[PDB]
Amino acid sequence: PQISLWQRPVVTARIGGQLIEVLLDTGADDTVIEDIDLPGKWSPKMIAGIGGFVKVRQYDQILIEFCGKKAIGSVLVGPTPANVIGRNIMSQIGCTLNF
Amino acid sequence: PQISLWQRPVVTARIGGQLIEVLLDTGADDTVIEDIDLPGKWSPKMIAGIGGFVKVRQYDQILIEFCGKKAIGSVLVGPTPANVIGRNIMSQIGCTLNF
Numbered sequence: 001p002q003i004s005l006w007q008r009p010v011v012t013a014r015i016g017g018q019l020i021e022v023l024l025d026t027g028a029d030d031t032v033i034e035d036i037d038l039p040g041k042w043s044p045k046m047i048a049g050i051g052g053f054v055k056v057r058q059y060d061q062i063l064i065e066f067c068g069k070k071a072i073g074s075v076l077v078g079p080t081p082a083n084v085i086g087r088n089i090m091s092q093i094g095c096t097l098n099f
Numbered sequence: 100p101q102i103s104l105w106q107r108p109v110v111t112a113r114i115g116g117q118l119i120e121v122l123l124d125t126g127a128d129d130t131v132i133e134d135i136d137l138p139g140k141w142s143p144k145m146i147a148g149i150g151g152f153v154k155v156r157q158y159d160q161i162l163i164e165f166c167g168k169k170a171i172g173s174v175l176v177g178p179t180p181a182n183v184i185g186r187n188i189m190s191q192i193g194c195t196l197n198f
């Protein structure tokens with residue numbers, strides 16, 4: 001699709017089988033979600049933003065689906081105020097920023 | 100321009116006359132710049148990012164130019180780990196996400 005930015009670019013994604021409202025976020029290097037439970041081993045990571053840092057769990061090889069597209073990649077899970085799909089996933093599906 | 104997302108979408112912008120590299124950040128409502136001095140009056144404000152609130156100075160009616168495009172808007176000056184252009188500016192210059 002071709003999504004303009006007059007409002008927040010929010011879409012419904014299925015991540016690990018769960019429906020989550022997500023922001024398509026070119027400022028996010030990696031996908032970060034708050035409200036999800038993913039199974040198995042994870043690695044401890046941290047992310048940095050405006051106001052400070054968030055500790056996150058990194059889950060690898062997760063199925064991410066939205067807007068008819070499908071990708072597999074890592075998901076950082078933690079107390080973020082916004083659920084974002086970042087460039088780790090958007091690059092994989094050929095998403096570009098255009099004007 | 101067509102900007103891929105396999106790397107950070109960083110462009111050179113002129114913001115109130117000042118040349119600065121900035122991140123095109125679709126997940127930011129607002130344009131937040133740390134590395135800038137802007138003249139004139141400003142409004143004290145607090146904005147929340149991923150780690151909570153930070154104090155910024157809001158400058159209004161700033162001319163922002165990048166990649167053969169121009170828009171006028173507000174700039175928040177304050178601490179951020181990346182100088183970001185938000186939707187306040189990107190929506191005015193017809194920026195779209197495409198995939």
Ligand SMILES: CC(C)CN(C[C@@H](O)[C@H](Cc1ccccc1)NC(=O)O[C@H]1CO[C@H]2OCC[C@H]21)S(=O)(=O)c1ccc(N)cc1
Pocket residue numbers: 025026027028029030031032047048049050081082084086124125126127128129130131146147148149179180181183185
């Ligand atoms: C500041 C960016 C370099 C990084 N952020 C992505 C960014 O798009 C966040 C995404 C975001 C969105 C809402 C709340 C927190 C974070 N937006 C943001 O901080 O915007 C602020 C300026 O405009 C305002 O509008 C929204 C918050 C304010 S981030 O959330 O900290 C972030 C950092 C790393 C990862 N992997 C994922 C996300």
